[PDB]
Amino acid sequence: GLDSVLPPSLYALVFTLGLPANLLALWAAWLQVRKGRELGVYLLNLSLSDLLLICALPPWTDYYLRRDVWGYGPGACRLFGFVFYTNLYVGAAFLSCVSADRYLAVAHPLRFPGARPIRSAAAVSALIWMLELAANAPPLLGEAIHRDHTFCYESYPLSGRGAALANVGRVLAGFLLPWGVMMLCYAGLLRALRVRRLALGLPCVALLCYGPYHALLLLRSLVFLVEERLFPAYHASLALATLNCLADPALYCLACPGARGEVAKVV
């Protein structure tokens, strides 16, 4: 329906103008690590993930555009689910680490960050990917999604044992802990600094692109455990969880000098 219909037009306009921004973010994040900034590696990782997953649209926006619920038998849905799961969970983890890092810089005393150089940040960036890739699937039973206008990740078995309670787990572990840590970082930053506007754009951005998804999943899950027109809504929620990728490079590059640096780099 129409609540299905708008996402693909937003999609026509996200890949076109959201690849340059995430390329330039990587440029600036390197030229900060070459400067020794312990913070440029996080933006390197985040821009890598965003750049990888922006070229993965002509599968997903294709099937969500070619009216393909299962255009492939067993192969389409597994790939689509893996892509979306990893995309949004990586985005969340990178924003959360960026927030805790900037908190340590601005507000925290020398004690913790002075012993936090670039080698430490490379270690934690490896750990995040390792956890996200290795520990995602064993909590999916090894048979994650199956038969399914449904979008990518969508399916049609009754949730059962492998879908519902694990959805409650994924909502309360992919959203609440990251959101809580960003909020505690922001409130503590204010408790010290009363670079202060920026540092509260990330939690709001993460919410406005990954909050309705978690809440509407939670409702889908606690309705059952304890869907006619309620379904056109899940497409809009997925479009939010998509367009976060466009949102983030605009916020990160808010300080004006980076714009000139990148432009002079390219033009």
Return the CATH number at 53. 1.20.1070.10
Owner of token pair 């039973």? 141
Distance CA 32, CA 102 (A): 14
Instruction: Tell me if 22 is assigned to some domain.
Output: yes
In 10 A of CB 197, how many CB atoms?
8
What H or E segment, with its residue span, contains residue 235?
A: helix 232-252
Instruction: Tell me if 211 is assigned to some domain.
Output: yes
User: For residue 165, which of 92, 217, 228 has the smallest C-alpha distance?
Assistant: 217
Sequence-separated (6 or more) residues with CB below 8 Å from residue 4 = 64, 149, 151, 232, 235
Query: Structural domain of residue 197, as residue ranges?
Result: 2-135+162-266
Q: How many domains does the chain have?
A: 1
Instruction: Tell me if 148 is assigned to some domain.
Output: no
Instruction: Tell me if 174 is assigned to some domain.
Output: yes
Q: Tell me how far the alpha carbon of residue 29 is from its chain's centroid.
A: 18
Instruction: Tell me if 18 is assigned to some domain.
Output: yes
Sequence-separated (6 or more) residues with CB below 8 Å from residue 231 = 149
Angle of helix 75-106 relative to helix 232-252, nearest 10 degrees? 40
Instruction: Tell me if 149 is assigned to some domain.
Output: no
> What are the distances in angstroms from CA 121 to CA 118, 124, 130, 197, 221?
5, 5, 14, 24, 37
Residue 7 near residue 236 (C-beta atoms within 8 A): yes
Distance CA 247, CA 201 (A): 10
Distance CA 175, CA 203 (A): 11
